[model samples]
Target: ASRILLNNGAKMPILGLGTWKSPPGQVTEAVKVAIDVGYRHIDCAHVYQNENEVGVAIQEKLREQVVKREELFIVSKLWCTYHEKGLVKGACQKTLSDLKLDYLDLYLIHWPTGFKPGKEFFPLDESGNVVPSDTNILDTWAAMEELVDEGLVKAIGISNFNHLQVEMILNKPGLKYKPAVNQIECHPYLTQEKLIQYCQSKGIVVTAYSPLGSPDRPWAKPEDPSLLEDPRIKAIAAKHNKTTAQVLIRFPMQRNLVVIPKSVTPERIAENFKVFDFELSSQDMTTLLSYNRNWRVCALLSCTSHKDYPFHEEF
Candidate 1:
């Protein structure tokens, strides 16, 4: 339940529950169980297609007075399709309605690659390729700042953004608000140390999504390396008398990054939250860093052709 102070003067939980790929029927129960077990932050998104169920759990908890609205830090993202000039507000409003909340603790632009805004989330063409939108991310960010003025969101941020893309926002003319966070996929394999340091230098917090290496990601190949089963990580876990998952979950936080590990299983949910009781030593942190191979689990290779694709630049 530890919190990080955002540049906007709001606090966000250092650890959170990621809802990506969490199945519809089980996400609600998992969210409720997580809340019952002392989780205060829940990371969500419109593309996940389960916010309504998540909302149900939150509403039930509110009705039972298990937790107040102010106690929970709910974070949602604006999907790629919603990056149009004036579409940011509607996208956030739709997410708020689905989440059954008046405002979000943190709202993020999901990805740098923009798709044509409309009924389809992918907005693909007949040839099975994603249609790109010409809207500038700065325009989308401007609309996001207005959300703060409207009291619809406490803080705004970007997800899956590279260092150069972030610099564009930092250097944008007439910028009203700086991005509070850069939520990106981070793990031992993709530590992104330099990018994290750069964000810190600019006073932007880094949130690590897929911190457990996203073993369950749909595109994961059978030959893909497993972070949880790595001998080095297992050795470190044994030294600390913790599970490998616990070690992985604690790794990013030790580096001052907010981490969100997703799970719909009750046992895993409970286990992931038990990291606060222990700390990884400096040597252990360095050992974990040595395992970095610049590997990425959630590389949106499909969007690589897009002009605004953020990953094209080195971090």
Candidate 2:
């Protein structure tokens, strides 16, 4: 497996296992199975709420010597609610405690947007069910950098942030970390070509989530144009003799970005890991890059109207 070097000299696996929506009961076994199948990088977050199960597997693997701590690259995220400086360290420590790991290979700010710590998914109105306004995003970003200085995380980055958001955090004073990576909803339908270029220029690694256009996102929406069946992606798939999922995954990877495709099904997991065996052609790569329409899935629309919202453009 190839690796990307962070500014602090930590090595991150180019490919990582994603546990975004992996079923609660099945994540433990999935973690074990993925490792058993030669995956050493796992991407997890407190929002997923499956760290306990994942922790169990990691401990078991370590106890049994299946893999060492340094051999495995663990990527976890700091939740939005824990953005406050005083609350940030505890949040990351809690995740480490849950995962039963000493230090995280990489830690990411789950989103550029944030809200009150205890607030439920959506905010409620005056009746205690009203949505609360977004918390200060930079405050949370600063706390994230503290994790690095404290030696809790090897590197720090942000996710679901546009180039503008990255700049805001970058421009802030006392930024000890350079936001090593910016992860977002990247796929064939939303290629994010310019954003990719921007991140590269800023020396920030970009990781692509839902690289297969998130066909199995569970939110299906029914109205979303399926990226798996997109004519352009399909054409590229046919030329490479790859599945639509592979085409999407390979597209971002060929551009030197990290890609994480989520799956719990055995066959799908195996299929998603088969990208390195075959390479896409140069012309095909250009065609895929041309499909960037700047679409994104993890948009915080409701937050846009929130008083603390930063960016002016819609996600």
TM-score of each: 0.98, 0.91
lDDT per residue (tens digit) for residues 31-87 in model 1: 999999989999999999999999998989999999999999999999999998788
- Give one digit per residue, the lDDT tens place, for model 2 in 1-315: 478877677777788788888887888888887777777888999988899888888888888899988999998998766666677899899999999987898889886655566646454456443254345677777777777788898888888777788888788877767888888778766777767788888889899888876666655687877778788778878877888887777777888898888878877777777888888889888777777676556655566665545346543
For every model shown, the clashing-pair count is 0, 7
Clashes of 2: 7
RMSD of each: 1.0, 2.4
Off by over 4 Å in 2: 119-122, 127-135, 307-315
Q: CA lDDT of each candidate? A: 0.92, 0.78
